Amino acid sequence: IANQPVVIDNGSGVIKAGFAGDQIPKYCFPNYVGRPKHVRVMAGALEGDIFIGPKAEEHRGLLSIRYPMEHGIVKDWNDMERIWQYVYSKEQLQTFSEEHPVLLTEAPLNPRKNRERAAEVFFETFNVPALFISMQAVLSLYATGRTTGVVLDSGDGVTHAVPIYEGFAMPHSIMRIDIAGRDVSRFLRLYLRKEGYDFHSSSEFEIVKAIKERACYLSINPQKDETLETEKAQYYLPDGSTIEIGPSRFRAPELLFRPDLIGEESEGIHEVLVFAIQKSDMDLRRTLFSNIVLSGGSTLFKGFGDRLLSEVKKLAPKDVKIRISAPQERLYSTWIGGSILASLDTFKKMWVSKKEYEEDGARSIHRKTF
Amino acid sequence: IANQPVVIDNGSGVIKAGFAGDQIPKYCFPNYVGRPKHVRVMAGALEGDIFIGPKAEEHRGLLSIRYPMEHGIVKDWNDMERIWQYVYSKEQLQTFSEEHPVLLTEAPLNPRKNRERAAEVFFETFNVPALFISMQAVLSLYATGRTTGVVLDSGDGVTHAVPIYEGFAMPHSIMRIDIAGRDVSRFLRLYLRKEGYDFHSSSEFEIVKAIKERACYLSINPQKDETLETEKAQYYLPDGSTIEIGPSRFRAPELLFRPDLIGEESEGIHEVLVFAIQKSDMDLRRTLFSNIVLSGGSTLFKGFGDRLLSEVKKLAPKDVKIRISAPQERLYSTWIGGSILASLDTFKKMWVSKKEYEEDGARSIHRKTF
Amino acid sequence: VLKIQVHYYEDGNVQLVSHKDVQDSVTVSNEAQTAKEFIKIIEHAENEYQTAISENYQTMSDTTFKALRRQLPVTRTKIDWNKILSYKIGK
C-alpha cells in the first residue's frame, strides 16, 4: 500500500495540508477550535457546535476560540484530533486516513511524550499505514534546493535556528526560544491597552493578529525612534471604528530581538542565529554565515531582514560576508520541502510503518527520527 | 608582617575561605554575582544592588545570576574583584587584606595572562603583603597525608588528573578537560526540555543544579539502562509543582565519561585518569594506580567510583591492583590542604612578597609557582 | 644549523626530527663582548627553538593533525551507522 502520501505541516498559528509533489499547499487554515459562546434558540442554526477552518474565520464573534498548540507543544489533545479529523474530512481533503501514508512536522527539542502521543493518535484513532515525523529546518532547505546553511525560522509558537551542512542537521547547535508571533501579538494587545483600545475576548484577539500582520514595521535604530515622536497612523476595524495605533506598531515586533520587554530573559532571534553558528565548528562558520535562510510568518515584518543583518554585523566577527536569503513563499517553505521529501523514492525507507509500530512501539519512532 | 594567613580556594562553582590551621572552611559560598532583574519601586528595598553569597541564595528569584569564572578561566574581572572584596568584608571574614598573607588556588595549565591579572588585583587593588598561587592536586594530597598518588578531581569548571610521586608534581603528565559539573548541569537542563519541563532563567538555572546534586545516579552498564525502561521518579521544586524526571537523571552525568554527547571533542574523566598514569615513567605507574584520590563535587554521583573502577579495569593492563580512594569531605579537600600548607613554617619561603613583586613583576610570580 | 631528535618505541613508534638553519651578522669589539654576544645569539635562538618546538606542537600539531583527521566529525556527533545504511543524499 504505497499511495500518494499526505503532508500535514503542523504549526501553532496556521496549519498547512495537501498531497505530495505539489507546488503549493492547497489547504491552509488557522489551527484552532472555535466553539459557540451564545445559546442557540432558533432552529436552522450552525450545526455541530465545533468549528474549524473557514467557518470559524467567517463566524469569529460567536466562537470562544482556543488554540490547542502553544510553542509547538499541543496542550489540548482532543482538539488536535478534531483538527486532524477535519483535515482528512470531506470539507478539505476528501480522502481517507486508511489509504495514504502521513508526513508530519514538529519543532526541534520538543517533549518526547507529545511526539509519542502524536504517533498514538495517527496509528490507533486514525488507521495510518505509515507515519514519518520531521524537522522544519531540514524541509525548508529541501524546498530552496540547498544542502548547507542555517535556517532561522519565526512561526507563531517557536523561533529556532538549526545549522545544516551537506545534509547533516547538527543537533547540538540547535538554539530555541518560546518567543514568537503569538507572543508578539499578545505583547501588541498589552500595548494597545496602554494606548487606549482593549481587546479582552478570544474572538476579539484575532483583530490584534490582523493589526500585527498589516500595520507593524521593524525600525533599524530603536533608540532614535524612541526619541522622535510618532505620526499615529490609522486603522479600520471589522466594525468600522478608527484606531490611532501610535508607537505600539514599531515597539511590538521589538519583542523578538529584545525579549526583556515581555519579562523573560531570553536570547532573541539575532542572538539565536549567532549562537547557532558559534556552537557549530570553526571550519563550517563562514559557509553557515553565507547561507542563512528565513521562514515563518513572523519574519514578514517590514525591515526585519535589514535589522537582522545589522544585528549580525554587530555580533559576528568582522570582515565576513553576510547573506540572509529569503524565498518568495516563506509561509509555505516548510510544506514545499515536505512535499518534495515525500515525492522522493527514499521516503519509503525513512518512515515508520504500522506493523513496525505495533511490534516495537515508541522506541522505533525515536530511532527513525534520529 | 607574618600574621595568620588566609586561604582563598578559588572555583567556578563554589569559593571557599577562612584562616590557616583549621579543620573546615568556615566561609563557603557559591561563586557568582546576582543583580536585580525587577524594578525597585518601593522604598526600603534590598540595598546595594550587587548580591554575593547567602543573600543571593536567599533572594534567587529577584536576581539575574551570572558566573564570572568558566573552566577555571575568569571572564568578568570586575565580578571576581567584588567577590574577593565580599570575602574580605565584614559580612564574611571581618578582616583587612593588609594584615594577612594570601594563599590562592587555580586549576593547572591555565592561561598565564589570567594568573598575572589575578596577582595584579591582589597586590594593587587590595594591599596584600604576600601572595602565593598553588595547585589543587598538591593541596588535596597534603590534606589526606600522602605524597605519592594521582589526584582525579571534578569541580564545576575543570576536570584534571595530576600525578605526583613523593613531592614531584610532574607538570607534563597533567591531563585536563574543559568539561565538568557546569556542563553536566547545562546538559541536564537540555534534557529536561526534551522531557517537557523547560528552565531558561538564570535564577531558575540553580534549580537544575539542585536536581543534579540530589536526583542523579551513574549506571555501570549504560547499554543495559538504555534497553530497559525507566521508573520515572519524582521531585518537588522550590515552588511546589512535581516533576517526573524520567531517563534524564542517568543520561545527564554520562557527559563526563562520554564527552561527545554535548558536542565537543574531549577524552573523558576515566580516559584522563588512565592518560595521566600512562604519560609518567614506567617504574612509577603501579604506585600511581594504587593511589588514586578523588575530589570535587561532580565525583559525588551515585555509582561514580564504581564506574571509574570498571573503566580503569577495561583500559589499564591486566593483573594490576586498582584502588580509587577518597576522603569523607570531598568538597573541602583542597582547602584543608591549603590551610595545612599555610600553617607550615616553610610557607614563608615559597610566597611572592609585595616588595619582590614591585621590583620584578610577573616574572617573579611565574618563577616561584614552578 | 640546529638539529633535535627524539624517538619513542613502546607499543609502536613516534619520532621527533628537526632542524633550524640560521644566518647572522655580528660585529667584533672585545673578548668579553664577543664571548657574551655569540652565546646570547645561541641562548635566544635555542630557547625560541625549544619554545616553538614545545609550544607550537602541543597546540598546532593537535590542530593540524586534526585538520587531516578530526577527533569528531563536522557535526560533532558520533556518526550513526543506522543513518548511513538507510539515507540518500544529492539531487
From Swiss-Prot, chains A, B:
It is found in: Cytoplasm, Cytoskeleton; Cytoplasm, Cytoskeleton, Microtubule organizing center, Centrosome; Cytoplasm, Cell cortex. Signal peptide: none annotated. Keywords: Acetylation, ATP-binding, Cytoplasm, Cytoskeleton, Nucleotide-binding. One of its GO terms (molecular function) is ATP binding. GO terms for cellular component: cell cortex; centrosome; dynactin complex. SUPFAM superfamilies: Actin-like ATPase domain. SMART domains: ACTIN (SM00268). It holds the Pfam family Actin. Its main location: cytoplasm. Belongs to the actin family. ARP1 subfamily. Part of the ACTR1A/ACTB filament around which the dynactin complex is built. The dynactin multiprotein complex activates the molecular motor dynein for ultra-processive transport along microtubules. Part of the ACTR1A/ACTB filament around which the dynactin complex is built. The filament contains 8 copies of ACTR1A and 1 ACTB. Interacts with dynein and adapters such as BICD2. Interacts with BCCIP (isoform 2/alpha). This is Alpha-centractin. It comes from Sus scrofa. The gene is ACTR1A.
Curated annotation (Swiss-Prot), chain C:
One of its GO terms (biological process) is barbed-end actin filament capping. GO terms for cellular component: cortical cytoskeleton; F-actin capping protein complex. Its main location: cytoplasm. The keyword Cytoplasm applies. Disulfide bonds: none annotated. It is found in: Cytoplasm, Cytoskeleton. Keywords: Acetylation, Actin capping, Actin-binding, Cytoplasm, Cytoskeleton, Phosphoprotein. GO terms for molecular function: actin filament binding. Belongs to the F-actin-capping protein alpha subunit family. F-actin-capping proteins bind in a Ca(2+)-independent manner to the fast growing ends of actin filaments (barbed end) thereby blocking the exchange of subunits at these ends. Unlike other capping proteins (such as gelsolin and severin), these proteins do not sever actin filaments. May play a role in the formation of epithelial cell junctions. Forms, with CAPZB, the barbed end of the fast growing ends of actin filaments in the dynactin complex and stabilizes dynactin structure. Component of the F-actin capping complex, composed of a heterodimer of an alpha and a beta subunit. Subunit of dynactin, a multiprotein complex part of a tripartite complex with dynein and a adapter, such as BICDL1, BICD2 or HOOK3. The dynactin complex is built around ACTR1A/ACTB filament and consists of an actin-related filament composed of a shoulder domain, a pointed end and a barbed end. Its length is defined by its flexible shoulder domain. The soulder is composed of 2 DCTN1 subunits, 4 DCTN2 and 2 DCTN3. This is F-actin-capping protein subunit alpha-1. It comes from Sus scrofa (Pig). The gene is CAPZA1.
